[PDB]
Amino acid sequence: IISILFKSIFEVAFLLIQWYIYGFSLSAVYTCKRDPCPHQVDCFLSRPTEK
Amino acid sequence: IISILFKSIFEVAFLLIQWYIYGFSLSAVYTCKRDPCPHQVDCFLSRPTEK
Ligand SMILES: CCCCCCCCCCCCCC
Ligand SMILES: CCCCCCCCCCCCCC
Ligand SMILES: CCCCCCCCCCCCCC
Ligand SMILES: CCCCCCCCCCCCCC
Ligand SMILES: CCCCCCCCCCCCCC
Ligand SMILES: CCCCCCCCCCCCCC
């Protein structure tokens, strides 16, 4: 029983973490505002739809 | 008299136009926000202090 409970707990925890960090989709264009980049810059991902 | 008046008028008009457009100094770094440039970009002048 403990093993089954822990399996479910880990599954739920990983799903929640993924939802918080990324969501469940990826966009083609990303806006970056981190040094040393000046102001904001546009970046482009690889294979967003397939992913 | 008319010629002297017009000389002075033209001088004042040109000074006012220059003050409105540029001022009386130039900075080394310029911020550009015009298409097709994305977001804002930084540009650098030539010989700002001498000018
Ligand atoms: C000797 C008892 C073995 C049964 C273990 C079932 C519980 C496993 C919990 C896993 C916790 C996470 C470890 C990385
Ligand atoms: C089963 C794995 C648990 C891992 C817990 C780690 C938490 C990750 C950090 C949470 C977000 C921090 C944002 C500052
Ligand atoms: C069993 C439920 C499966 C449906 C999950 C749908 C998640 C939302 C995905 C939205 C993607 C839209 C394309 C950008
Ligand atoms: C025949 C009279 C000549 C005297 C002319 C003095 C006035 C000049 C006015 C200039 C106006 C701007 C012309 C471009
Ligand atoms: C003696 C020369 C007179 C020239 C007058 C031209 C005015 C210049 C335009 C004024 C600024 C327009 C901002 C939209
Ligand atoms: C007769 C008065 C002459 C003084 C004019 C000064 C104009 C202001 C210039 C400021 C430049 C400061 C360096 C960026």
CB count, 10 Å around CB of B48?
13
Q: Which amino acid makes up residue A33? A: K
What are the distances in angstroms from CA A14 to CA A2, A8, A17, A19, A21? 18, 10, 5, 9, 11
3-state secondary structure of A42: strand
Dihedrals phi, psi of A22, to nearest 5 degrees:
-110, -35
Q: Residue B26 in contact with residue B51, Cβ under 8 Å?
A: yes
Question: What technique was this entry resolved by?
Answer: cryo-EM
Query: Based on the number of CB atoms within 10 Å of its own CB, is A26 exposed (0-12), middle (13-18) or buried (19 or more)?
Result: middle
- Helices marked H in A1-51: 2-21
3-state secondary structure of B2: helix
β-partners of residue A29 are: A44
Q: Which amino acid makes up residue A10? A: F
3-state secondary structure of B42: strand
* Cβ separation A39–B38 shorter than 8 A: no
Q: Give the closest-approach CA distance of B20 to chain A in angstroms.
A: 28
Q: Residue A28 in contact with residue A48, Cβ under 8 Å?
A: yes
* Cβ separation A40–B39 shorter than 8 A: yes
